[PDB]
UniProtKB/Swiss-Prot annotation:
It comes from Gallus gallus (Chicken). Keywords: Allergen, Antimicrobial, Bacteriolytic enzyme, Disulfide bond, Glycosidase, Hydrolase, Secreted, Signal. Belongs to the glycosyl hydrolase 22 family. Substrate binds at residue 101. It is found in: Secreted. In the egg white and polymorphonuclear leukocytes. Disulfide bonds join 6-127, 30-115, 64-80, 76-94. This is Lysozyme C.
């Protein structure tokens, strides 16, 4: 599924991400935009052989099981394929564990490089939330 901006903002708020660990909804929408372009089916292989999955590009090195990331963990206790669903519940639940892990949203390098410090409220501007 390819979400629209306000459609995703609404779904993220529906699943309790708005202001989770103090990160406003615009931070989450901006991270999704630059990680996946709002596409739930996005996959991208890393140089080290891990893969990032879904709307928030969650990495198999730590967070989900894809059966092909030797030495990796599965701290969200989910198959990485669950992170590609039209329903974002699994991605949200796992993202809540990642952003609690100690470095907040810096875990998402695209958030650190493209969203952090910016006018992230623009991402929810106009949305009926
Ligand atoms: Cl957009
Ligand atoms: Cl915001
Ligand atoms: Cl594996
Ligand atoms: Cl594990
Ligand atoms: Cl699995
Ligand atoms: Cl959803
Ligand atoms: Cl923080
Ligand atoms: Na893994």
């Amino acid at each position: 599924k390819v979400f629209g901006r306000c459609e995703l903002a609404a779904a993220m708020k529906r699943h309790g991400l708005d202001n989770y660990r103090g990160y406003s909804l615009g931070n989450w929408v901006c991270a999704a935009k630059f990680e996946s372009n709002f596409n739930t089916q996005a996959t991208n292989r890393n140089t080290d052989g891990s893969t990032d999955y879904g709307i928030l590009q969650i990495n198999s090195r730590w967070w989900c099981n894809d059966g092909r990331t030797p030495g990796s963990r599965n701290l969200c206790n989910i198959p990485c394929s669950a992170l590609l669903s039209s329903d974002i519940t699994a991605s949200v639940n796992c993202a809540k564990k990642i952003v609690s892990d100690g470095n907040g949203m810096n875990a998402w390098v695209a958030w650190r490089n493209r969203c952090k410090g910016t006018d992230v409220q623009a991402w929810i501007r106009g949305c009926r939330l």
